[PDB]
Design a protein around this ligand. Structure first.
Ligand SMILES: [Cl-]
Ligand SMILES: [Cl-]
Ligand SMILES: [Cl-]
Ligand SMILES: [Cl-]
Ligand SMILES: [Cl-]
Ligand SMILES: [Cl-]
Lengths: 243, 248, 242, 248, 249, 249
């Protein structure tokens, strides 16, 4: 019935893009399902949210037959929906971790760019090829990408549509760790789950908001967050051995 | 060559305008005459029906930077006037509707490299020597070496390169994010360029605007802008035709 | 005292000295660091170099101190960290951190406000403090991404991953790795050869580029460039060609 | 059951949703229960086929501010949690597709007034008593009294009003830019509201987005954004029809 | 002259001022594409001239009633976008000019026309001026800064109110909001204000203008740093040094 | 230094207020280098005292006519830059102070002196005040924020107009533009406003001041996030808790 599944592994909610017969390409139905499952994942008592694809591939990008059906109005409406999910990923109290494999491209990869962390399987094919069919970006491929890789790499990747392997994407900053085995990805995710929730939440907020202000203001904010952590029971317990 | 006399040449290669800094006897170092010629040739390239603009140097080198006899002649007023001219060309590169691609080779230093930092894309021949050495003679930057550089390589590398004047090889510059591709052959650079020329003009223009303006706003605002550009692409015939295989 | 000040040619050398606790930063150390940093600024040295005594740069904030905080005293600690970080960023002189052994958390984060980071080959570099519930000591969330990008910043801070020196270099968190102290001093000495005003303006433009749009920043860079031509040291450096 | 005890009512008045803060025995002071009810009613108003949302208070007063007994019960954790809830409702007001219009009267102060500062438009009855007095009891701001207020009245007035807690009459508030229109009669307020209802929905929505995001970016970027929105309006049937009298 | 072509924008000179006149009075100087192209053109000529300020006004009773409504009604999204890029481009040239630009508002001064004037450095209004942005009524958000420049002049609340309601202001009301800088009951008094600006050293007005504009794109400290640098560079300017010479020694 | 000797800047105490007095009345309290150095010293002293606010005014009839024009006339670019860095530094210490700073304007209140006051949190004006930035007449862009702080007080249009024209305002006019916050016909009434500010908890005023200042360096959401965090930290402050104690339980 559903093009996005929600599952559970330990302390992680696991969201799975499930349309493998079309390389998990994102259409309107998938987008609506992704928003619904992402809500469910946020309300659960899990500590992180992991996003991946079903089968061999993460996602080949936006559905091209859908793209080809758009006029300006319906295109704008599609992008508002993309933006909204990307924003919910960025504003989430929980860390969001994308697990990339096989095809990881375009609009799908761009949603992963809003995630906190990207881990790639060694077989991953990563890139933003949609300029070839006249599209600028699915969801941050022009305005979030450069914060990950720099101004020059962002333009190059978006204009050329170059496909990267996993090590090349890591060396640019587009991916944070490469693993040859799924268990090793879960080990990294599980280690993140050990950290206090409020701590991760504040780390995430300060990182995000660093892009919207000058340094001093950002440092002021980071200090205030640090201070509020001392009202949190989980943080105080994590420190109690040294009390 | 008797017929090679102006300080910047303009040429064409298919869908690319090709702008060539031509003062090889001085390692294509930038003086005022060169700057004026570069602004002129850049306008010509923008008005032509080419799809991209490529900037390089004549001979073995891209450019060794600002002309040092010119720098040594400056007082504060004439120095300010020079930098306004550098800033203006840099800005025309960034605001251009067309993608601008710098093709670096041999010496690619200082002011010249810094102009290339405003380009959209930097491709380096394997023999390229890349750096900003002008702090050694007391200069902060020619044209973005302090305020554009860190958007390419990060805060730490920017300060280190600008302060130390360290010379990089092509792979090192690539690993820092200062260069986007290294090639051992000119033909391979042209292949990358020609592949960019296949993409719809309006698409590349919008990609360029959104990337540029991402540095002047918060994320949400930038995302809103990216979405609006996406939407406007559906008014463009070249985009629509690129999508037509899949229509219906 | 827990921070020493020394001189090495044209460089002021500030040494975090509490090796029995891996040069971990407590309040007393912070107060000493502020005092020594002032002294280093007033001296006729051209750069300021910060390192640790013995094998390690610094393991981070003192954990017993952290554990004693409530929200008010935590805020007060962070204001002090912020203030020293800000003085490092606003200094007329370049500040260069020389990392070795343990170089972590709050200590590393102070080094992230420095202009340049050089690492000895044995350095262990990271921000592990999320493990004990801390977001950041001093810019580990808001400065770090300006060095390494949004994705690496989140990953390092959340995971607490410990990096070796080459790994830190490849991310942009460190600028040069050397297997010998003499090679670090050669880099430092080369920086000392540049005109003072030049370095001060480079630092000033880089740091402010994060607080404005490009055109404004380019306008500012041009104005600094112009004011350099009122500086005797700059004019001298150009005189061979005049 | 639930109807008798809601602290925020929702009503409908032509093309306007009307949200009414209803706790008059405590001068419509905002407690947690009121905040939860306001969030709910605001959602309902957004989903209805009304064109604007109007917010006011029941009886003589708009609101005297945050409930002081509640403030006095807070520690840092519960204070943070309260402000996150204030922030969230303020943010929904600013991000709403529909214009939001605050109708001030009698006491219009502190946290309540500050919510109204996130609205698009403030209209004041002539009897309104307006200010941010909460610094007297050690509070910086309820909901934008420090960070939104200066965008309305300027840096100087914001500091002065927030530090001094000065009480304003309606004309004084208008002259500062804190209020947009003063009326001696409720009917005149509704005439202004009804006129806003006549404008095409998409147009008002875009005006609102451009104004809000103009505070997060430089001019050129904002001008680019305004132009894109202007262009997208020509896909909207209501806009097209509004222009049709002049077609050809 | 068998090839004579008329112009919708005229340029004149009035001492140290270039004077640019929107001239389509039969349509209330409403801005169409041809007018836009002529404005861009005349504005370049005015910048080239040795004049010290540029003044913009309308021919006859009115400054401008706004964008041409028949033109608006002919647009689709592509042609609308192309029109706004042209508006943006002229507004930007006004803001980046080395010379102060002064708009002289009278009669109908509205919509797109008024919005161009909002990019000018100074607005002076004749007493008969009818000032506002009414175009929301016909579904338009803004002609040229009516949403994003307007709040920098009048504040967030006034901007939304004026743009949403389409309220028409009289000249004093517009002055009190900050939308206009001075109101005069006759043209000679406007020229006296313009002449007073022409007395100041060029480089000084230029640097004032740049720092004000860029103050909206950065934090305070950065802006203060920039203001200081400009201050310093003024001491390389002959006109500034002469203005100070009475007090030398 | 001692009470019976005259100095260019005096420091006094008036209840819970430190009172800093620019004292060179024979030159209309015009700011020279010696005055600047003294102002920085006296400002430090005022910050370290256990007073709750800092008030800045001038001796005698005037606040300050501006920068000393003979000094301006002696500058070259290097010494001008060095002067402005000192002005910037005192302006910044006023804006970063934990204590509210209140300028009390009277008679001539202009140029560099007025511009320092523009960095203050609050400006109160005696009814006789003559207020403006006339220094463009002698080729100067601004003394200390007259281009980059002014528009945050009065808007983009009024800033350019005031700075370019050099127009002199009366107190009511300045108030209506937002350049001044209150006008009083009596000094006692100014002190009543000041003393009322002294009743508020210190930490509260400090946080109000920080949030306002940092609202100019970020988008709204971020600023709202910051305001909420400050709010929360106030509940660790004894003086705030005491102020709320009447209503506890
Ligand atoms: Cl895609
Ligand atoms: Cl150079
Ligand atoms: Cl730590
Ligand atoms: Cl309240
Ligand atoms: Cl119009
Ligand atoms: Cl002055």
């Amino acid at each position: 019935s559903m093009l996005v599944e929600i599952e559970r592994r330990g302390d992680a909610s696991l969201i799975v893009l499930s349309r493998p017969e079309k390389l998990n390409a994102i259409n309107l139905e998938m987008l609506a399902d992704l928003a619904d499952q992402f809500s469910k994942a946020e309300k659960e008592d899990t500590r992180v949210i992991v996003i991946t694809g079903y089968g061999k591939n993460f996602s080949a990008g936006a559905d091209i037959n859908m793209l080809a059906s758009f006029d300006p109005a319906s295109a704008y409406s599609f992008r508002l929906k993309m933006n909204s999910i990307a924003q919910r990923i960025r504003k989430s109290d929980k860390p969001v971790i994308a697990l990339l494999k096989g095809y990881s491209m375009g609009g799908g990869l761009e949603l992963a760019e809003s995630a906190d962390i990207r881990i790639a399987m060694s077989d991953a094919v990563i890139g933003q090829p949609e300029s070839s069919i006249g599209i600028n970006a699915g969801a941050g491929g022009n305005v979030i990408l450069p914060k990950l890789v720099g101004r020059g790499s962002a333009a190059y990747l978006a204009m050329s549509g170059k496909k990267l392997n996993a090590q090349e994407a890591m060396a640019l900053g587009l991916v944070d760790e490469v693993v040859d085995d799924e268990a090793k990805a879960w080990k990294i995710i599980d280690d993140i789950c050990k950290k206090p929730k409020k701590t991760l939440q504040f780390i995430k907020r300060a990182i995000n908001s660093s892009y919207d202000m000058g340094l001093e203001s950002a440092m002021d904010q980071e200090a205030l967050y640090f201070s509020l952590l001392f009202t949190d029971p989980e943080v105080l317990d994590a420190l109690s051995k040294w009390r």
